[PDB]
């Protein structure tokens, strides 16, 4: 029922479980990229390059 106390109100619980083994990380989260400011002596790193 939608008339519960906070202790028993329906809570959506998602257990995001991360896993490592002798395999490459087929799932990553590298969603942090700079922009492309060009033609200056700078530090570039093209995805590990």
């Amino acid at each position: 029922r939608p008339t519960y106390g906070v202790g028993h109100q329906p809570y959506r619980v998602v257990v995001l479980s991360f896993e490592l083994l002798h395999a490459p990380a087929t799932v990553c989260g590298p969603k942090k990229s700079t922009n492309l400011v060009k033609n200056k002596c700078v530090n570039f790193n093209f995805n590990g390059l």
Partner: antibody
Amino acid sequence: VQLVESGGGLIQPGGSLRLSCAASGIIVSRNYMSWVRQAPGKGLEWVSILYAGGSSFYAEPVQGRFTVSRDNSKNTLFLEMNSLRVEDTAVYYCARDLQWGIDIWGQGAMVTVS
Amino acid sequence: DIQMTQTPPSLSASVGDRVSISCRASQSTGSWLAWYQQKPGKAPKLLIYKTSSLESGVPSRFSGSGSGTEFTLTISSLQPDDVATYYCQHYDTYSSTFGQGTKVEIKR
């Protein structure tokens, strides 16, 4: 938390009762509550449990007869005994059930069916 | 069904003495047994649950142990707060089964 029960008295066989028990110090819609009767000269018998979600779980003998409920606004557990039997006489206690079990015991209401 | 038996039904011991009481189930319950203390005219107080966990508030002198079929409560030293009846309850989400009760009194 104090559980204060009322309605303890005499009732004819086959009659209807509504035992009450106010819970003080906690919100009834946030904890498990239970009805447990102790007959004179016997151990305890947990007869029913109402969850904080309104999910009523009755024992098979009391399934279809007794109605466990809670008034969150009044914060009071109620038990609607229906189709009473001779064996339904006992000191009936409202109680608070938890992960660990029954921690808060009501003072109890006597119930005599004869 | 599942029936638990308590021994001794008639025990007279003195304050300071141990009170060794035994409650045995006919078959294995694993760990779903609890020790309670009830006085006449009073409701039982849960002394120990899971047969090894000290219930919060009950004196540590009570040492409940056991599994499966057999269980034993040991009052290390009797005290006047321990002069009462003792029950063992098989734990179940439904009605379950309770012990017959070991009434402990002051020996004289």
